[PDB]
RNA sequence: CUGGGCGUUAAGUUGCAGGGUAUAGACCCGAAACCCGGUGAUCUAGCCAUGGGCAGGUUGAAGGUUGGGUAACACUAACUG
């Protein structure tokens, strides 16, 4: 659902560089973006179960990078969930 | 018609008094009712407009705020109401 361009605009605010595309915050951000434009899908359609399916695989997904982060690099985890405004 | 029925050989009429009858309330009193035209919503029934009344004490719906909760909901606790 993300374009090439709001993907790469991403990658370059997050990562080390643009070719920085598997860093975990890069990852947890391109999650996020993709989960907050899914919401209004989902708020018009309520019965489409199986893009649904798709969205919980990516919540799934951002949970266990956010917890290898936080096992790791606490600081990093702390700045990241602050920039993206994620309760945890 | 041999006949048979009704008649012919018995004074009426007009007043006055009286007895009966008729039409009328017709010896007097008495219904429940029926019809016609009026008077009544100062009681009461409903409605319409315009004003008033309801000491004192309780219960604690929805809603709201904050926290928890959720990807977002949902949901949950306290306070408020
Ligand atoms: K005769
Ligand atoms: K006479
Ligand atoms: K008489
Ligand atoms: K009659
Ligand atoms: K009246
Ligand atoms: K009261
Ligand atoms: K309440
Ligand atoms: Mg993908
Ligand atoms: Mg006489
Ligand atoms: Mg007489
Ligand atoms: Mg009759
Ligand atoms: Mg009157
Ligand atoms: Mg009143
Ligand atoms: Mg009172």
Redesign the pocket.
Known sequence: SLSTEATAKIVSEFGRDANDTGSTEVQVALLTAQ??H??GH??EHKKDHHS?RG??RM??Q??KLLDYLKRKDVARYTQLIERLG???
């Open positions: 989960i907050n899914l919401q989902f708020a649904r969205l919980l919540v799934s951002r949970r994620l309760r945890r």
